[PDB]
Enzyme design. Structure first.
Site, PDB file in Angstrom:
ATOM      1  N   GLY B 175       0.774  -1.237   0.000  1.00  0.00           N
ATOM      2  CA  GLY B 175       0.000   0.000   0.000  1.00  0.00           C
ATOM      3  C   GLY B 175       0.803   1.283   0.000  1.00  0.00           C
ATOM      4  N   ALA B 178      -1.124   4.136  -2.098  1.00  0.00           N
ATOM      5  CA  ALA B 178      -2.201   4.682  -1.282  1.00  0.00           C
ATOM      6  C   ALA B 178      -1.639   5.620  -0.215  1.00  0.00           C
ATOM      7  CB  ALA B 178      -3.006   3.560  -0.647  1.00  0.00           C
ATOM      8  N   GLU B 201       2.739   4.392 -13.505  1.00  0.00           N
ATOM      9  CA  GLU B 201       2.061   3.107 -13.675  1.00  0.00           C
ATOM     10  C   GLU B 201       0.542   3.261 -13.730  1.00  0.00           C
ATOM     11  OE1 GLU B 201       2.303   0.184 -10.426  1.00  0.00           O
ATOM     12  OE2 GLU B 201       2.861  -1.358 -11.888  1.00  0.00           O
ATOM     13  N   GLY B 337      20.591  -0.171  -4.969  1.00  0.00           N
ATOM     14  CA  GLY B 337      21.040   1.194  -4.651  1.00  0.00           C
ATOM     15  C   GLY B 337      21.365   2.062  -5.855  1.00  0.00           C
ATOM     16  N   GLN B 365      16.868   8.933   8.833  1.00  0.00           N
ATOM     17  CA  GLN B 365      16.463  10.332   8.955  1.00  0.00           C
ATOM     18  C   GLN B 365      17.675  11.139   9.400  1.00  0.00           C
ATOM     19  OE1 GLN B 365      12.714  12.967  10.254  1.00  0.00           O
ATOM     20  NE2 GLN B 365      13.152  11.286  11.679  1.00  0.00           N
TER      21      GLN B 365
END
Lengths: 387, 387, 387, 387
Positions: B175, B178, B201, B337, B365
């Protein structure tokens, strides 16, 4: 100049062969044509070797013929020079000593050549260095038991002993990684020994997260989704405190070769002292290249690693999907061998109910029994406890 | 010099016409007078065509007459030259082949002329360029941070910030599409910022169908098989009304290059203002050519895109089938990668139960923590909601 | 001469980096070392990039060191020249504009180089031409629904719509070719639309023979073995008359690439108008090279073809021998995918009795139902009729 | 010098083509451009062939055009030279005779070139010789029934006949080698014919040991472990005496090619006379290279060997492990074909009880019946006896 040489000794070697054909055997063992400094002697020695390989008698006539056909007679001074060689040998029986003198002076020339080559590269490429020193190392050389913490597993094994290659194979999701980490954790925190952990699939912090949860009894998902009970937090500080004193060394390099593993462990043992080596699954270790033969060499190398550092090496392995086709057995890693011979102890992890209990099947043990040790697994803390 | 030409073939074409008048039809179809390199042949071919257009017989006499009246006979060498042409043709029936040779050499001269012309304009006008390249194209052818809406994700990220390359990787059916659409929808409808969506797509209407369902709570399959409750229909009008005010710009180009993406976003920001860029999976973006090195450059380019437009770029990625071999980690995109370095934030989507809940693993992060944010997924509306 | 250049701007770019290290990011985005006209500037920019890739600070000292180690300092004018560069920048913040000037003059040099190259090839190779023009095209650029006729199938589909990729898979002998030809025939003869047919296994006349029989009701074997009833002959003249008015364009090229298909359809639509594309089996289309990855790209390309020309594309496919191992389903083309995703409509042909009846299983349809439409097949005329 | 040539004939050939384009067909059949001694004529003939391959008319104009585009006109003397060629032909119809003269003088030049080349190599490489003579052979050329002893097997076969390829296939341990040796032994000792045996897996002495035991009834293991009864020893002297008179020629070369087999048998038949060829298993014969296609060629070659020397060839073959999956049949060697067609007689050996009896299944026989002949096997002597 002048380059280390011994024309007199070169002449005596070749002469010896012309006096006694048996002298070529000792000479060829010690020398190759290129060891001769003088080009003519290289050509002559090479002619001798060719005649010899044909199973033909090596004497003045056949060598003369050989050089004539390779258009090298005049170039080496004719048969007249071959006569001089025959006069240049004090005693044919001393051919090995003459040969060693020639060899000695060949080795010296190679030393001088490679040393000069290194010196020159120092000025040229400048422009790398780390590679330079390593190939400088390389080129110069060329010129020349432990308690597991699981009382029931300790009964059978006694426990994991120095120089042994221990292989713990299990299907995905069974809990082989957690098992290996528990042992590594028990050894480092309980005993005064150092454990070296290689995690190729899992990062260093991702692995510490699992042994922090295991240590102080912190709910795994609780940290993942954090979340955290204020006193489950104070539970973390005690886990860290006790876990900081442990001698745990982790290398989370994605896909190392065995030589890198070996070199790192090598330095560690003689620097701080080493007690165990744990490697998070073998099928991830890449070969010396850039896969059945490849895996056998790695296996063979890990056993050599165990013997060298006099330390038990625990290498995790993954099972083929044959078990599901059948409780794991030796044939499940035999289709992925030849780890079966190199390992003096092979252990399988079977989960009866995929009871939060897990079975540890010791299928192979060179010095001791064969059977099933049973332990309980706690999903919430990612731990294996006694029974 | 010398310019591509074939006097022999030119002579044979004109000769053919003088031998068989029917030869002019094939010749005139393939050639115009200007294709002839020699001026005399242009004049002669032009005389032939004139006589022919009058419906008069084209032969040596009428062409002679025609050229005499246009004062061109002597200039082209007289009737004597017209005789030579008649002797210069091996076989009149081969006139098309002779003609094609003349044409071929005319086209080459035009290529040389236009190419030279382009080269010269390069030094002269310098002094435009964008027009220069376009007419060069033309002439050659002629010859032929930002709140996410998910409170818990906003805690960790703060949220998605300007100049950051955000990568959301997930296995098929998890998902990710979405997820990206929910964020794009939350930003555009809640905040005053514009979102640029690239769906390679999925088509533009097929994508709006999913965010209409998500918006006003309309059962997805209900629209697909339509079906539709009268008040589930009134639910659609409110969804449209609220969704019309949003600054959502969609480009559903099958397989764009990064330069096209960049240019479009470039124009958009300075024309209406841009806040986010969402790209429906990276592995579909084609390179600058016509695939590991190729994918690294695209990754590197998307980061440059983020820095330039001072906007967070969310690029969806697909995971290798390694997770199933093992919960996703960095090595799953590392075999694909080198997106790992370029991305200052890498997020994985894991579904515990493939609980209609889904886990968002922030593996990387640069400025902020690393952990798992958890959200609930509703299949019926194709939505991610808080917890 | 002189080649388009801007030494002043080149100097300002390099200078900027020495004044503010952050200037290298914008410069490297816009330029590569080779864009610099002066060799020294190439070497300098290259040294900067190397230092930067190491994550080391890029300033006058590290660049000096870098060039010293690569033996390029004196060659580029020493540190003294690097000082001049630092004095040659009006404002470091304007580095992008300086950079664009350098780039602009690099592009111009490439234009001049390729144009000259084309001009020279015009005199040399002469000796091809068709390849010459195509690579001249190539090199310059680089410097920069429909009713089916089957009432019951029309109910479900509505019918075959623009931009849709329709895939009709069937085992050999089932009658997929006949099915596709019937649709192509119904569209061209009944509606005012043009159909493009690609027959890779069957020749153009061999295919017309089958649609002549289908058209006027002529026994297929009767023509094959000819044979022919005098009035079955008059039946042929009416078939031809009615079939001549149809817009049927056939390409019977043995094994085309998708680019050739695309280019031909491209020209056709803008020249006469295009409504459908039918391709006689996909597994025969050869890739861009000279087969699972290859087939996915073709599939992906056919969908792009449908979107571009806003036309339904009917691509026949062949089923694996799995059906016989079992009525066909999605997994039978999934072992030969990934045509499953690209196709917005997948149809199977199943013959209950291999009743001269045949089943058309619509396994996938993005906008509309899923089920079995049934039609009767007549072997004698090679036709599918209603029910 | 001067090299054999005919400029006059070369000129007439090219001229002929310019007078009658049909003359190129006979010329191209007999000549290639390189046969022409004069470089200009090579270029001209090559231009003609190129034009012809394009399906374009070959005459003075198209050849002129062709040479102009390949920048060879002036080099060959211009169109003016092409005119001379046209004047140099007595009669275009005689082009084949002109052509043959050109060819004749080309062949002579090749003879002179290769002969000189051989002569030169004689002085240079000197330094091999065996290879020299063989390539000298090679280079010069380039410029240009039997009773089996088993009464029941003789009934069906009649027995093994001249030019027939007989294939005896059997699983390991069944006794195919012993079977072939018994036949070879019976033929040589009983009849006046010579047998050639190729044993690729078994050495010459190791094979004689088995036929000595078979001959005089000596216990096989008795010799192996020797051991030997004094009169079992006298049994050996009679075996040798009788076996010395037999014409048995053995070649125990590990892995020969078929050409070596052929050459040896070739010399043998015309030197002493040959009657049978027995080859100890086909799968060991290596191909002409350095394995399904490879095995078919060997099979095909052995049949050619049989026809040439008018001798039955008995080639042993090994069966696939399909029999054990099932009594052997044709499909067991068909998965390892295509020996099935080449063999005019295929025999299988089946042992009912793996009764020391063995079955000989004649599955194929081109001239005669198909059935099972039965014989008894004695392990102690390694013999097959009647019944």
């Amino acid at each position: 100049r002048i380059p280390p040489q011994s024309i007199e000794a070169e002449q005596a070697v070749l002469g010896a062969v012309f006096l006694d054909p048996a002298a070529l055997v000792p000479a060829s063992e010690i020398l190759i044509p290129e060891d001769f400094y003088r080009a003519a002697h290289q050509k002559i020695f090479h002619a001798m070797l060719r005649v010899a390989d044909r199973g033909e008698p090596v004497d003045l006539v056949t060598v003369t013929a050989e050089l004539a056909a390779s258009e090298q007679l005049e170039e080496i001074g004719g048969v007249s020079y071959l006569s001089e060689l025959a006069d240049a040998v004090p005693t044919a029986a001393n051919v090995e000593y003459y040969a060693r003198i020639v060899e000695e002076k060949s080795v010296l020339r190679r030393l001088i050549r490679t040393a000069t080559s290194i010196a020159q590269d120092g000025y040229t490429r400048e422009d790398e260095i780390d590679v330079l020193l390593d190939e400088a190392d390389r080129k110069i050389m060329e010129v020349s038991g432990i308690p597991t913490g699981f009382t029931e597993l300790d009964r059978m094994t006694s426990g994991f002993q120095r120089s042994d290659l221990i292989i713990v194979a299990a299907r995905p999701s069974v809990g082989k990684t957690a098992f290996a980490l528990n042992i590594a954790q028990n050894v480092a925190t309980k005993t005064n020994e150092n454990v070296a952990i290689f995690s190729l699939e899992m990062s260093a912090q991702q692995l510490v997260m699992r042994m922090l949860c295991a240590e102080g009894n912190i709910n795994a998902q609780n940290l993942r989704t954090g979340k955290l009970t204020p006193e489950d937090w104070g539970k973390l500080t005690m886990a860290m405190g006790s876990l900081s004193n442990a001698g745990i060394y982790i290398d989370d390099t994605p896909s190392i070769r065995v030589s890198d593993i070996r070199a790192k462990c090598r330095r560690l043992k003689q620097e701080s002292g080493l007690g165990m080596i744990v490697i998070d699954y073998l099928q991830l270790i890449q070969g010396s290249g850039r896969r059945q033969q490849e895996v056998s060499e790695i296996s063979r190398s890990l056993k050599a690693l165990a013997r060298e550092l006099e330390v038990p090496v625990i290498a995790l392995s993954q099972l083929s999907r044959s078990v599901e086709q059948r409780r794991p057995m030796m044939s499940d890693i035999r289709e992925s061998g030849s780890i079966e011979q190199d390992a003096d102890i092979v252990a399988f992890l079977y989960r009866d109910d995929y009871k939060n209990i897990i079975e540890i099947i010791i299928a192979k043990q060179r010095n001791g029994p064969v059977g099933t040790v049973q332990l309980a697994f706690i999903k919430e803390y990612n731990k294996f406890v006694n029974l």
